[PDB]
Amino acid sequence: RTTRDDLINGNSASCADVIFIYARGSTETGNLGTLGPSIASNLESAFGKDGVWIQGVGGAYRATLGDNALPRGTSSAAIREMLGLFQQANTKCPDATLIAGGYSQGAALAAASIEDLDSAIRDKIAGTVLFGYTKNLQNRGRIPNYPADRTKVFCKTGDLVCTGSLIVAAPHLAYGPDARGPAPEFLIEKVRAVRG
């Protein structure tokens, strides 16, 4: 369940209405890690199995710990990868509503990729949930070039990565309940507002 390739294995002849691209934290298994699956199970509950594609950022995204120390908090390979999946969503299913998310390094990944994204594709991302956002201070609680009103950052008090650190403290491991309730609920609200 920690590997999902709904978009990649998806085709333009049979598109989902919603596409969720998600980035995992450093060293997490699969393309979804610990938080991806709970988010994805809840979405499928809202829109139906056939109503939503779940797509982890795999491939060139190795989610290496040293990569947090790079300028934008992740590698360029990883950014090119995530951008490509956004692109692949846009072409494969141009009527799809997009949603996005990341944890730790993958929060850095999502934010870097969404900044870089063509404004036309970025406009289709209805919401983005970030957990233990490692560039939360550096980007002032926001994703550059993306609306605060489509962004939800979960950054617990005493999660040091939210205040410009790379030190992992216990509050950084406690996003479990957020990925099971608040996070997907925000995503679901945003999609339904956009789509009607």
Curated annotation (Swiss-Prot):
This enzyme's EC code(s): 3.1.1.74
Active site: 104, 159, 172
Protein's UniProt keywords contain Manganese: no
An MF annotation (GO) of this entry: cutinase activity
PTM summary: The 2 disulfide bonds play a critical role in holding the catalytic residues in juxta-position; reduction of the disulfide bridges results in the complete inactivation of the enzyme. O-glycosylated; contains one mole each of mannose, arabinose, N-acetylglucosamine, and glucuronic acid.
Means of activity regulation: Inhibited by n-undecyl phosphonate (C11Y4). Inhibited by paraoxon.
Reactions mediated catalytically: cutin + H2O = cutin monomers
Function of the molecule: Catalyzes the hydrolysis of complex carboxylic polyesters found in the cell wall of plants. Degrades cutin, a macromolecule that forms the structure of the plant cuticle. Allows pathogenic fungi to penetrate through the cuticular barrier into the host plant during the initial stage of fungal infection.
Protein name, as recorded: Cutinase 1
Species in which this protein is naturally found: Fusarium vanettenii (Neocosmospora pisi)
